[PDB]
Assembly symmetry: D2
Homo-oligomer: 119 residues x 4
Amino acid sequence: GITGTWYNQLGSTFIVTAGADGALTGTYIGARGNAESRYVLTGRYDSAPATDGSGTALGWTVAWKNNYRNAHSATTWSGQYVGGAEARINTQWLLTSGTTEANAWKSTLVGHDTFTKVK
Amino acid sequence: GITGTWYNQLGSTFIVTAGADGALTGTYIGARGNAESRYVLTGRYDSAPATDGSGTALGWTVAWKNNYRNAHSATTWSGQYVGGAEARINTQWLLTSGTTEANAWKSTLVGHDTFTKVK
Amino acid sequence: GITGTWYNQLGSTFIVTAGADGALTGTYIGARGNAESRYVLTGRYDSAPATDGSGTALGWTVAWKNNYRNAHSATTWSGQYVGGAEARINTQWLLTSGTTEANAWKSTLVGHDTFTKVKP
Amino acid sequence: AGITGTWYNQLGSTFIVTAGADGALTGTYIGARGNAESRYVLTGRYDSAPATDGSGTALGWTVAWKNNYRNAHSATTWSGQYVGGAEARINTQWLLTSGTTEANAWKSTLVGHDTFTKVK
């Protein structure tokens, strides 16, 4: 149930394929929906989750460089998939920007996001 | 630079390869260091970093399932590689465990890890 | 504005008074709602926020010890109050438990809470 | 409780705290510069009856970055544990939230870690 298209609250889309070996691969698209707004995503997920109502643990990374732009940063999302009619991926995220050593204390933003199969 | 064998403060080993396409691929070997403790890692990095002294942003994910055990959890690391002599990768991490909706609020741990090429 | 009784999505109640000197003081009441689940809270907030439509930064702590029990843990919430129609405080939080050295890598939980003056 | 006194981080900041019998933490945070313009009030909570099995003492505290001389419209919360001994330390994780507009709330909060010791 993870393979497919997921949308967040702020306009982004990510298309992902969950491979049988635990791999997540796809593309993350920023609000602009532009070719310049498409980035590669890669991650991992628990390919044999509990069937007791627990979610399916997963994570993925996007580095914010493509052929058109580079923000010298990477985001990682860590969270869980929950299936059913109200299916959702609930995540918390870390965004790290390349900095000098003196500025390393403010290198990393933290936040959360929920994705759904419909907008 | 990034490609090689790295060690965290606690005794774990991260064997990584950085591809020209921005990809990170490798294997994580927990403190014990036997086969049952090896897990697949995948991630992404900024393959064209700034030239002004800043680090190179990167992230990766490990899902804690292999052929021998499954913890129904995944860790994502978010940070930056700082080169020179005494190369290091400084990270913050998020470990999420699959949980029921009732326990979702305690699903994610956070910490920090620093990796070096010297055990 | 910030002073009052606020509720999170999971049933808890936050009773707070915002002092003129930037002090936050109050009581946190867990979902159960009985006296065994009342805890003291203390914090700080920006008492002179920007006038450009930014939120008001704030934070507070609750150690999870009262006269009835002691979880050997403490939670800090960091966030901003956003005024308006349906006023809210958006926060992220860190809960650290006391642990030994060998287990300090799993001491700290991270999460997020949204509070409103209207109870779910 | 071992906690009262002066604590230093590696980046050059100092904090002076008093640990109250009731679980109160009160004090002053002094940034690297060292002058009055770099002094701010701190308040928090700690576990006043920690376990005796060698586990750390959970605590947290908040500073809002406003004094009489300046206002950065932000606040930090530190969540951690005190570990006693000859080389006592407070190990923490922190969140720094800045007040922002709603359109920028997604980049409102930084996370990091810091360790404080009794010797500079």
